[PDB]
């Protein structure tokens, strides 16, 4: 482990630290914007929710087909954001397709 090797590794990790910090700043700005309009989006989505909130509707017993809309981004570096959604989709397609319902998945993301 020459001083050369130690220096190379140290410099590389320093660069990685700087880049990650700047990336954190940019993600913070984007999150600040996304939280801002999440409040207007919230009540609008609640309007859609109200349909089954008041008019309680459930799938009768079984559907011939099924649609699974798993939404996510195309950019990673967000922990398990995509992983969790994929896991839920896999659990559902495992949960479904036993009753015969042909599940289909639209991968937004």
């Amino acid at each position: 482990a020459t001083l050369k090797d130690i220096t190379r590794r140290l410099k590389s990790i320093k660069n990685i630290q700087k880049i990650t910090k700047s990336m954190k700043m940019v993600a913070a700005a984007k999150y600040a914007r996304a939280e801002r309009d999440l409040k207007p989006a919230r009540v609008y989505g609640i309007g859609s929710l109200a349909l089954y909130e008041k008019a309680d509707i459930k799938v009768p017993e079984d559907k011939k087909k099924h649609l699974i809309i798993g939404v996510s981004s195309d950019r990673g570096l967000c922990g398990a954001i995509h992983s969790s959604v994929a896991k839920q989709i896999k659990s559902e397609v495992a949960n479904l397709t036993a009753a015969g319902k042909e599940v289909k998945i639209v991968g937004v993301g």
């Binding site: 190379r8 590794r9 140290l10 410099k11 590389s12 320093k14 660069n15 990685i16």
Partner: protein, 53 residues
Amino acid sequence: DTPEGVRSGAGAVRDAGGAFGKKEQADEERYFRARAREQLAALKKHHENEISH
């Protein structure tokens, strides 16, 4: 700041030759290997077009 402190430079990640450097090397290749295929196919289409005309 103080000059004595070790100072990093551009390319250190690749110069290290560690996992992150290898990831950068492979990632660049995977992207442009695909891009070359698209570019080559477009060139083939251009050649076919000029052959037709």
